[PDB]
Design an enzyme around this catalytic site. Structure first.
Site, PDB file in Angstrom:
ATOM      1  NE  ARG A 167     -10.603 -10.461  -3.291  1.00 32.99           N
ATOM      2  CZ  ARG A 167     -10.919  -9.573  -4.229  1.00 32.99           C
ATOM      3  NH1 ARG A 167     -11.029  -9.955  -5.494  1.00 32.99           N
ATOM      4  NH2 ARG A 167     -11.123  -8.303  -3.903  1.00 32.99           N
ATOM      5  CG  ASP A 227      -7.800  -5.594   6.492  1.00 32.96           C
ATOM      6  OD1 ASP A 227      -8.872  -5.148   6.033  1.00 32.96           O
ATOM      7  OD2 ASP A 227      -7.071  -6.384   5.860  1.00 32.96           O
ATOM      8  CE  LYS A 268      -3.775  -2.287   2.442  1.00 31.99           C
ATOM      9  NZ  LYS A 268      -4.797  -2.131   1.372  1.00 31.99           N
TER      10      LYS A 268
HETATM   11  C1  LIG Z   1      -9.016  -4.329  -4.920  1.00 30.18           C
HETATM   12  C2  LIG Z   1      -8.188  -3.633  -3.837  1.00 30.18           C
HETATM   13  C3  LIG Z   1      -6.880  -4.403  -3.658  1.00 30.18           C
HETATM   14  C4  LIG Z   1      -7.891  -2.193  -4.257  1.00 30.18           C
HETATM   15  C5  LIG Z   1      -8.968  -3.646  -2.517  1.00 30.18           C
HETATM   16  O1  LIG Z   1     -10.196  -3.573  -2.506  1.00 30.18           O
HETATM   17  N1  LIG Z   1      -8.218  -3.752  -1.413  1.00 30.18           N
HETATM   18  C6  LIG Z   1      -8.821  -3.843  -0.070  1.00 30.18           C
HETATM   19  C7  LIG Z   1      -7.942  -4.722   0.825  1.00 30.18           C
HETATM   20  O2  LIG Z   1      -6.854  -4.322   1.241  1.00 30.18           O
HETATM   21  N2  LIG Z   1      -8.454  -5.933   1.084  1.00 30.18           N
HETATM   22  O3  LIG Z   1      -7.664  -6.830   1.924  1.00 30.18           O
HETATM   23  C8  LIG Z   1      -9.069  -2.604   0.526  1.00 30.18           C
HETATM   24  C9  LIG Z   1      -8.470  -1.419   0.098  1.00 30.18           C
HETATM   25  C10 LIG Z   1      -8.769  -0.213   0.736  1.00 30.18           C
HETATM   26  C11 LIG Z   1      -9.667  -0.198   1.803  1.00 30.18           C
HETATM   27  C12 LIG Z   1     -10.009   0.975   2.473  1.00 30.18           C
HETATM   28  C13 LIG Z   1     -10.896   0.889   3.543  1.00 30.18           C
HETATM   29  C14 LIG Z   1     -11.278   2.026   4.245  1.00 30.18           C
HETATM   30  C15 LIG Z   1     -10.771   3.262   3.872  1.00 30.18           C
HETATM   31  C16 LIG Z   1      -9.889   3.358   2.800  1.00 30.18           C
HETATM   32  C17 LIG Z   1      -9.398   4.610   2.449  1.00 30.18           C
HETATM   33  N3  LIG Z   1      -9.693   5.644   3.234  1.00 30.18           N
HETATM   34  N4  LIG Z   1      -8.660   4.724   1.336  1.00 30.18           N
HETATM   35  O4  LIG Z   1      -8.171   6.074   1.002  1.00 30.18           O
HETATM   36  C18 LIG Z   1      -9.505   2.216   2.095  1.00 30.18           C
HETATM   37  C19 LIG Z   1     -10.262  -1.384   2.219  1.00 30.18           C
HETATM   38  C20 LIG Z   1      -9.965  -2.581   1.586  1.00 30.18           C
HETATM   39 ZN   LIG Z   2      -5.499  -6.000   1.546  1.00 32.31          ZN
HETATM   40 ZN   LIG Z   3      -7.528  -6.567   3.845  1.00 28.08          ZN
END
Ligand SMILES: CC(C)(C)C(=O)N[C@@H](C(=O)NO)c1ccc(-c2cccc(/C(N)=N/O)c2)cc1
Ligand SMILES: [Zn+2]
Ligand SMILES: [Zn+2]
Ligand SMILES: CC(C)(C)C(=O)N[C@@H](C(=O)NO)c1ccc(-c2cccc(/C(N)=N/O)c2)cc1
Ligand SMILES: CC(C)(C)C(=O)N[C@@H](C(=O)NO)c1ccc(-c2cccc(/C(N)=N/O)c2)cc1
Ligand SMILES: [Zn+2]
Ligand SMILES: [Zn+2]
Ligand SMILES: [Zn+2]
Ligand SMILES: [Zn+2]
Lengths: 516, 516, 509
Positions: free
Chosen positions: A378, A314, A301
Site C-alpha cells: 500500500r 508479490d 514473515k
Molecule cells: C495485514 C497483513 C500484513 C497481515 C497483510 O495483509 N500482509 C500482506 C502483505 O504481505 N502485503 O505486502 C499479505 C499477507 C499474506 C498474503 C498471502 C497471500 C497468499 C497466500 C497466503 C497464505 N497462503 N498464507 O498462509 C498469504 C498476502 C499478502
Molecule cells: Zn508484505
Molecule cells: Zn506484499
C-alpha cells in the site's frame, strides 16, 4: 540496467520464452455441419446429456468415415456416460484401414457450462495430451458455447498444455512433444474463427505474466524485471520510461523509496504507454504491485503458515499489467491511451531498511506512520497512484496481491474489487464476466477510516479492525483526490496451490477492460 | 586469510590451546599382580560386587603397605557399598608414618561396564579431582575392562578433567592439575599401548570441542579456515583453501548461496593425509561447517529454536578436523584421507539468498529453496560433489543437520544413513570400538517424490512429509552418483546440554573408521 | 454388553460388512507362456523399462490379431513407463467384441518395493473405479516373488473395496498372467483372507467414536470370536478392579463407557509348542484428557484411529482363526477404553497403581496409551507365554523419526525382534528397528512414585515410552510396535489396516 551480483553465479536476467510450442500449432476451424474427417492424431468429442444425471454418450456429429461411424454408434457408446471430467480413449481402424485414436470428454448434464466447468473439461483434455506422443489434436464441439466461452476454452487449453522448463537442468522431461496441429469442429464455424488468434494472444499475455511470477527472486529482481519490461516495450513498439532512484527522489516518492531502502537492488519505476492511432476518447492508468520479494521487512514473515517461500508472487500485479501490455500492444485497440505503471522494489531486512514506527512522506505531501513493514504494498501503490493521477487519466485501476485477508473472504477463486466509483466498478465486473476471471465487489467501509487516524502523522499505514482488505482500500483511497479509481486484490487467487504454479490472473480481465 | 572486522575490537583468530595440562601428566601403568604402594597423592580403587545390588566393598588387590592393608581389611570396608557412582575418602598413615589418602569408586554389580556407566564412574572420579590440590592420582582397577574400554576410560577422564578457560578474564585461581597418573591393572603390558592412543584421541576430541565452544564472532569462516591451515602445517598435511573465486570457477552455487548474506567470504577447507606406502583405500571426510546458523530469512524465531546455541552448527567440521589431528599423529598406513568442509555463515542481510530461490549445484542440478534454515544440505551438496570428484572409495559426512534427531534417537545416539550396507557396517563397527554410539536409520525412497520440484530439478525440503532426517538424507543422496556414501547426523548428540559444553562427538568414531 | 446412550439417536453397534464384493471375485491364474487371451473385459499389462521413463514395449504374445496390432512397438512407444502412469483404450477384438486394453508403468527398477507396488495398484484401481467392467485381466511382465505377488492381490482387493457403511458394480472375474503360475496359485486364497483381516481392521478404525466405543468394540470382538469358534472373555469393571488394573482403569474414569478388557484365544488342536500374546492399544477416542489436544496441528479429529492396535490384533485373530495354524496358542488382548474430559477424569499429577504394584506419577493425561498397555502387559505375562508383542499408536514422535511409511519396533529380546523384522519382510508391512536407550531410563525416576509416566523431557518420546513399557515385563520376550505414524493414510483419508498381515505372518512363520 546492470543487475548487481553478490557472486558471479547470480543470474542477471529473467529467462523468458517468447516463442512457445503453442505458437507453432497450426489451428483450423471447420463447420460441424460438413461432417468430421477422422484421420490422424487424437479426435475428441465434447459431449453432454441434458436433464440426465450421468446420461449415456451419444455422438450427434456426422462422421465422414463408415468405419468410425460404425464404432461410434449409440449401441456401442451407451456403455459410457457424460459425467463432467470423465474421458475415454478408443482405438480403431478407419476406411483406409489405418489405425486412428478417438475419444470423448464428459461435459455433465447442465446445458450451460460454468467457467469452472469448462476448466474441468479442459483439464481432462490435457491429461489425454500428456504422456501421449500425438502430432495432431481434433476437438469436436457437440455442446453449446458462445464466442467468449469458446475463446476461454482455447486460452485455458493452451495455458494448461504448456509446461515451464526454464529452471529445469538435469530433469527436463525426455518425453515432452507438443502437437503441431489443432483441428476444431463446431457449429457456426465462421463466427468463431476470429476468436482463435485472440485466444493465442490472451494465452501468451497470461503465460508471460506466469513466467515473471514463477521466476524466483534471485532471477526476478527490481532491475531485471524493469529490464524485461523495456525489452517487451521495444518488441511492441510501445513508449517506455524507467525511473531510477534520483528521479524518484525528485518526485518526492518517500513511501515507495522507503520500502526498497533495505534492498541491494535500486528501485525501478516502470512506465509503459500505448497510444491509439487517432482520436483518444479514454485515457487509462493500469497500476500493478511490483514487490519482487516480500520478506515482510523487520515485521518478518516468521509466523507459522506465512508462506515466505511463496513471496516471489508479490509482483503478480505487475505481471498482470505487463501481460496486459502485451495483449494491448498486440491487438492495438483504438481511441484509447493506456499507461502501464508499476513501482517495482524489494522488501528486505537490512541495516538500511525502514523501521516499524518510521514516519514517511508520500509524493502528495501526506505523512504516513508505518505500523507494519509487511504492509509495504500500500506504500508503494500510494506513490504510484499519485503519479498515475498526475498523468491526467479517466480511470485508475490497480491490481495487487495486497492482503492475506482475501483468503478468508473470497478464497482462492474470486478476486475482490474496491473503488470510489460505481461505473468503473461495474466495468471491472463486466470485464470479469467476459474474461471469465471471477471478481466480486467488496465495500469500502467509511466507518473504519477513523482507525487510520495517526497521532503524529497525517495518516496511519494500518489499523490498530481485522478487515485488512477494506482498511487497505481506505488507505489507497487517500491518494486519489478526483479520479475514478478501482482496486483489485488478487492475493488469494494469484497462486494456484493445487497445481503449484501461477494463474497469471488479471491479464485477460484487464485486456477485456481496455478493449470493451 | 585476513578476517574482516566491523570494529577494531572484533577478534581476528580462534584462541586454541594445543599444550593442555593433560599433556603434562606423566602416566605409568603397573601390573596389579605385584601389589600397590600407597605413598603420596590420592589412591582410588575401582570396585564392584557382582550379582549383589549394593554389596559391600572388598579390596582384592595386594597392598605393599602393612598399615594400609590393615586399614583396608574386609571388616572395615563392609560398611560401604559398590553402588555405581559412589565414592569415599579415607585418611591414614602408612609404614613410613606418612599421611596418605585412599578411597574408592563404586562400579555397581554389573560385570560388564557400559559406555554410559563408565562415564558415570569417571565423573565421580573427576569430582574428587576437583576442589582438591593433588600432585598424583593413582587408580586401581578391580573391575573387568577390555583394551577399548580402558582407552575409553582414559579419554573420558582426560576430557572431563580438562577445563576450557580461553574466554575467562575476570578464571579459577584454585586450579592445580596433577602431574602424575598411576594405573594398576592385570595384564598391564597389553594395556600400555592404549595410553598414548587415548591421549591422542583425547586432544582430537578436545580440539573439536574448542572449535565448537568458540563463539561465532571468534569462529568465523575465515578464522576457522586459518585454524585448519595452522593445524595442517603442524601435521605436514597437504592443505588447500578454496576462496570465492575458485568456488565460482567450480560453480558451487548451492554453497556460495548460503554464504551470500555473510560478511565473511566462503572458505572451502581441504586437508589431505597420504600414507608413505601403497594406498589401498581412499576416504573423503566431509563436515558441515556453518559457523553460525541464524536460519537466514527463515529466521530461527520460533519458541525453543535455540538460536543462541547455533555456534555448534560447525561441529561436523570440528569433528573432521579433530580426526585430522588423530590421523596425522598416529599416521596409519595404506590409506589416503581427504578432510573436507564447505565453511560459511548463514545470516540475514540484503545480500542473503531468499526462500523460493532456485540455485544451481556444481553437478548442474537446480535446487528450489523452500527454507533457508535447511542450509546445511546445500553446502553439503556441493561438498559431496567435490568429494566424488576426488575419486574415493568411501564418502562419510558428519553434520548437525536436523532437529528431528532429538525426537528419534535423542541426545546419546547419532543416526547414520547411507547408500551402501558395507560402509554402514564399518561405521557401526567403528561406533562400538570408539564407544561413540550410533544407530542405523533408513533412507526411505517413498518420501523421495516429495522432493519433486515444479520448476527446479529438485526441492531442497519436503512439504508433505515430516521426518526431516530421512528427507535430508534423500536430498544428499542425489549428489552422490556412483560411490559408497554414509551420512551421520549429530544434531542431537553434538552438544552436552546438561554439562553446557560440546562433546566433540565423531572424532573418535571417524578415527577408528580410518584406522581399522 | 448394552451400549449406553445420551439420546435415543445414538448408535448402539458398529456396522460391519462381512460379505464383501471382493469375496465374489473369481480369480484365475494362468502361465504367461502360451500367450494371453483377450476376450472380455479389461486387460492391463504391468510393464517396466530397465531407461528412465522409457517407452512401453509389450513382450507377451497375445492370441488376438486385433489387439496384437494395438500392442505393436510403433504404437506403444508413444507411451512411457513412468511409475504409476497408465493408459487404456477401448477397441473391438477378432470377435467384434468390445474390449479394453492398457498398461500400468512400473518404472525402470527391476525389483519393485512395497511402496512401488502400491503406486502400481492405485493406478490400476483408478481404472476399475471408472469402468463398468465384469472382468479384469492383469499381465505380469515384471519380476515379482510369491510374497510380493500376494501383496499385489491384497492391496488390489483392499484399495478396490469401498466403505459405504455410513453413506445414506464390482468385477466378477480376475485373470492373472504370470510366469510359473503354478507356484503363485496358492497365494491367491491366502491373499483373500489377509485382505479381509486388513479390511475388517480398517472398518473398526474408520468407524467414528460414537459408533465405535469400548462397549460396541468389545461386542464386535465377541461376535467375531463366535463366528471363528475362538474362546472369548470380556472383563468388565468389577473383574478389572479385583485384578487391580489401576493404570488402565484410571484412563477410562472420565468416560461414559465402562472399561472393557478383550481377551480372545486361539488354541491349536495338537500339542501347543509356542504360546503368544498379542496386545493392541484400544483407545476408541483420545481427546488427550485434561492435557487436551488443543495445540495447533494436534489433529484431534483423527483420534478415533487411536484403537488401531486393537483393530490390528482383531484382524489378525480373523486370519489366524481362518487359516488355523498348528502347534500354537494365541491370546488376543486389548484393554479398551476412552480418554475423555469430565469431572471424573484422572488429573495431571495423579499417582496411580498398576496391577503389578508399581505406583505411577501421571505427568500428561495424553500419554494414556502406555498406562493401558502397562496393565495389559502385566496381564499378558501372567498367562505364561513365550512371546508378548504389543502394537500401538503410541507416540506422535514417530512422524519425525520414520514418518508415515515405516513403523518402529522396540524390544527386550533380539530373537523376537528379528522374527518381527522377518515378518515385516514377508508381509511387506515395513518396520524398522529402533533402540531402547538405557541411558534415558533415569529420566523416568519420580520424586514420589516408583516411576514417572513421561520424561520432562528427553525429546525422543518413542524411546522413553518403550522404557516405560519395559518396566512391566519382567521375564518374557517382549516387543513393541509403534504404528502412530503409519496407521492412517492421510493422502487417501482412510486407515491402512496396518499390522494385521505383519502379526499374522509372525504367528504363521
Ligand atoms: C495485514 C497483513 C500484513 C497481515 C497483510 O495483509 N500482509 C500482506 C502483505 O504481505 N502485503 O505486502 C499479505 C499477507 C499474506 C498474503 C498471502 C497471500 C497468499 C497466500 C497466503 C497464505 N497462503 N498464507 O498462509 C498469504 C498476502 C499478502
Ligand atoms: Zn508484505
Ligand atoms: Zn506484499
Ligand atoms: C528442516 C529444519 C528447518 C526443521 C531443520 O532441519 N533445521 C535444522 C537446521 O537449521 N539445519 O541447518 C536444525 C534445526 C534444529 C536443530 C537443533 C539441534 C540441536 C538442538 C536443537 C534444539 N534443542 N532447539 O531448541 C535444535 C538442528 C538443526
Ligand atoms: C507424549 C505425547 C503426548 C507428545 C504423545 O506422543 N502423545 C501421543 C498420544 O496421544 N498418546 O495417547 C500421540 C500424540 C500425537 C499423535 C499423532 C499421530 C498422528 C498425527 C498427529 C498429528 N499431530 N498430526 O498433525 C499426532 C499420536 C500419538
Ligand atoms: Zn539451519
Ligand atoms: Zn544448520
Ligand atoms: Zn493420548
Ligand atoms: Zn493415544
Amino acid at each position: 540496467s546492470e543487475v548487481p551480483q553478490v557472486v558471479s553465479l547470480d543470474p542477471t536476467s529473467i529467462p523468458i520464452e517468447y516463442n512457445t510450442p503453442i505458437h507453432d500449432i497450426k489451428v483450423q476451424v471447420y463447420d460441424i455441419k460438413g461432417g468430421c474427417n477422422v484421420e490422424e492424431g487424437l479426435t475428441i468429442f465434447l459431449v453432454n446429456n441434458p436433464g440426465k444425471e450421468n446420461g449415456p454418450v451419444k455422438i450427434s456429429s456426422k462422421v465422414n468415415d463408415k468405419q468410425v461411424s460404425e464404432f461410434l454408434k449409440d449401441e456401442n457408446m451407451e456403455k459410457f456416460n457424460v459425467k463432467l471430467g470423465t474421458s475415454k480413449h478408443f482405438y480403431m481402424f478407419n476406411d483406409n484401414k489405418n489405425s486412428v485414436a478417438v475419444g470423448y470428454v464428459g461435459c455433465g448434464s447442465v446445458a450451460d457450462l460454468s467457467e469452472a466447468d469448462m476448466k474441468r473439461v479442459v483439464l481432462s483434455l490435457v491429461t489425454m495430451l500428456h504422456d501421449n506422443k500425438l502430432s495432431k489434436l481434433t476437438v469436436v464441439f457437440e455442446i453449446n458455447v458462445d464466442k467468449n466461452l469458446f475463446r476461454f476454452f482455447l486460452e485455458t487449453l493452451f495455458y494448461e498444455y504448456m509446461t515451464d522448463e526454464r529452471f529445469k537442468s538435469t530433469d527436463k522431461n525426455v518425453n515432452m512433444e507438443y502437437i503441431k496441429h489443432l483441428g476444431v469442429y463446431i457449429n457456426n464455424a465462421d463466427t468463431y474463427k476470429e476468436e482463435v488468434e485472440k485466444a493465442r494472444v490472451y494465452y501468451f499475455g497470461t503465460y508471460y505474466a506466469s513466467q515473471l511470477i514463477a521466476a524466483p527472486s534471485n532471477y526476478c529482481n527490481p532491475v531485471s524485471l524493469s529490464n524485461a519490461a523495456v525489452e517487451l516495450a521495444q518488441k511492441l513498439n510501445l513508449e517506455y520510461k524507467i525511473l531510477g532512484v534520483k528521479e524518484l527522489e525528485e518526485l518526492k516518492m518517500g513511501a515507495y523509496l522507503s520500502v526498497g531502502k533495505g534492498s541491494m537492488y535500486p528501485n525501478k519505476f516502470i512506465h509503459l504507454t500505448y497510444k491509439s492511432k487517432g482520436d483518444v476518447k479514454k485515457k487509462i492508468a493500469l497500476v500493478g504491485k511490483g514487490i519482487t520479494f516480500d520478506s515482510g521487512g523487520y515485521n518478518l514473515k516468521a509466523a507459522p503458515g506465512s508462506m515466505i517461500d511463496l513471496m516471489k508472487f508479490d509482483m503478480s500485479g505487475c505481471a498482470a499489467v505487463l501481460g496486459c501490455a502485451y495483449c494491448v500492444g498486440t491487438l492495438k485497440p483504438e481511441n484509447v491511451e493506456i499507461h502501464f505503471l508499476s513501482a517495482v522494489c524489494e522488501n528486505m531486512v537490512s541495516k538500511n531498511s525502514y523501521r516499524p514506527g518510521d514516519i514517511i512522506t508520500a509524493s502528495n505531501g501526506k505523512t504516513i506512520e508505518v505500523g507494519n513493514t509487511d504492509a509495504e504494498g500500500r506504500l508503494t501503490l500510494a506513490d504510484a497512484l499519485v503519479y498515475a493521477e498526475k498523468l491526467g487519466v479517466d480511470y485508475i485501476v490497480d491490481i495487487a496481491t495486497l492482503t492475506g485477508a482475501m483468503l478468508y473472504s473470497l478464497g482462492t477463486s474470486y478476486a475482490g474489487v474496491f473503488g470510489n466509483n460505481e461505473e468503473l466498478i461495474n466495468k471491472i465486473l463486466q470485464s470479469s464476466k467476459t474474461s471469465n476471471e471471477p471478481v466480486w465487489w467488496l465495500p469500502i467501509i467509511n466507518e473504519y477510516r477513523a482507525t487510520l487516524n495517526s497521532k503524529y502523522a497525517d495518516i496511519n499505514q494500518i489499523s490498530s479492525v481485522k478487515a485488512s482488505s477494506i482498511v487497505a482500500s481506505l488507505f489507497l483511497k487517500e491518494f486519489v483526490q478526483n479520479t475514478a479509481w478501482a482496486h483489485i486484490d488478487i492475493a488469494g487467487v494469484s497462486w494456484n496451490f493445487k497445481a503449484r504454479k501461477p494463474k497469471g490472473f488479471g491479464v485477460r480481465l484487464l485486456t477485456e477492460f481496455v478493449l470493451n
